[PDB]
Curated annotation (Swiss-Prot):
A GO MF label: histone H3K9me2/H3K9me3 demethylase activity
Protein name per UniProt: Lysine-specific demethylase 4D
Note on how the cofactor is bound: Binds 1 Fe(2+) ion per subunit.
Shown residues within the full chain: 11 to 341 of 523
Catalytic activity: N(6),N(6),N(6)-trimethyl-L-lysyl(9)-[histone H3] + 2 2-oxoglutarate + 2 O2 = N(6)-methyl-L-lysyl(9)-[histone H3] + 2 formaldehyde + 2 succinate + 2 CO2
Entry keyword Iron: yes
Length: 331
């Protein structure tokens, strides 16, 4: 078995190997990349996502989210307080202000230490989940606005045509903005490109060990666990690397820099934080190997997780027994 320790793998495709997206994902899996839950892909030196980022300031962040923490430094939840709309140029100025800017630091490890020590004492503002794309239409390779859709993959594998569309989302971050422990909707893959700015640090649990993370989470967030049998779908819980190590949970970490892609694999729990002002683009995708994960994905039916239009067909076709209860939670 390839990659039996479930290490995060880093790939350097040539421009020739960068032509066929599906083929390269399948290659990475042939080398065991999925066992980690996360891989990094450094694009060939000839590739670019677009010519410049000089003209993005007028994008609107209609609902910036202030991420308010509760708990202890290594075990906390966050809630999202909606703020008034602002442009990307306004948000960048705010990220660089004395109140919100990255502190002085020696290196990524020192900054990681400072994040886990001090995150809970601040409430950074995240421009998350904005429908749109920064890939130039003329970028032919790994253009996250031109990937094959999940509905087309399901139809190709299973023969059933379904409603729904599959589009990318932009994330404008600042120091200490945080993504909570989660897997993707329906345990899909995700791909994330860091277009510009400061880094993003990721933590990930191998898919074969995801249930160990879930059992710890139920212990650490006992009221939330009684409320819902899949409360990690709410995307609000944080657990530090130190707490994971104390509880013997297998995980890995890596820092993504501007110009690099990350892929998360089905049922790969992940969490992380931004180092300073940045912009990422991400989308979900599927492969033939996903179908079995989609059929077994947990679901929130308490009402909290509330998701997209396109998830309805996935539940309805892959999980018909769960459909009625899940839909009640959606409505
Ligand atoms: O970048 C973020 O805030 C969160 N991204 C992801 O969870 C992802 O790309 O799957
Ligand atoms: Mg603009
Ligand atoms: Ni994700
Ligand atoms: Zn729930």
């Amino acid at each position: 078995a390839q990659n039996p320790n479930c290490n995060i793998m880093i790939f350097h495709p040539t421009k020739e190997e960068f032509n066929d997206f599906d083929k390269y994902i399948a290659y990475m899996e042939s080398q065991g990349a999925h066992r980690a839950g996360l891989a990094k892909i450094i694009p060939p030196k000839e590739w670019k996502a677009r010519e410049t980022y000089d003209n993005i300031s007028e994008i609107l962040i209609a609902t910036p989210l202030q991420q308010v923490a509760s708990g202890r430094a290594g075990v906390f939840t966050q809630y999202h307080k909606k703020k008034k709309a602002m442009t990307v140029g306004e948000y960048r100025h705010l990220a660089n202000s004395k109140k919100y800017q990255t502190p002085p630091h020696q290196n990524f490890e020192d900054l990681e230490r400072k994040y886990w020590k001090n995150r809970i004492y601040n409430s950074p503002i995240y421009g998350a989940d904005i429908s749109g794309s920064l890939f130039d239409e003329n970028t032919k390779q790994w253009n996250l606005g031109h990937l094959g859709t999940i509905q087309d993959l399901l139809e190709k594998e299973c023969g059933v045509v379904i409603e729904g569309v599959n589009t990318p989302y932009l994330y404008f971050g600042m120091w200490k903005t945080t993504f909570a422990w989660h897997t993707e909707d329906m345990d899909l893959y995700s791909i994330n490109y860091l277009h510009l700015g400061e880094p993003k640090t990721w933590y990930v649990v191998p898919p074969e060990h995801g249930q160990r993370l879930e059992r710890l989470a139920r212990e650490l967030f006992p009221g939330s666990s009684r409320g819902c049998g899949a409360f990690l779908r709410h995307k609000v819980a944080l657990i530090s690397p130190t707490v994971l190590k104390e509880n013997g949970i297998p995980f890995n970490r890596i820092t993504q820099e501007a110009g690099e892609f990350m892929v998360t694999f089905p049922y790969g729990y992940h969490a992380g934080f931004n180092h300073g002002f940045n912009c990422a683009e991400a989308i979900n995708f599927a492969t033939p190997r996903w179908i079995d994960y989609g059929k077994m994905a947990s679901q929130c039916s308490c009402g909290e997780a509330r998701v997209t239009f396109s998830m309805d067909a996935f539940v309805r076709i892959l999980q018909p027994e769960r459909y009625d209860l899940w839909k009640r939670g959606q409505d």
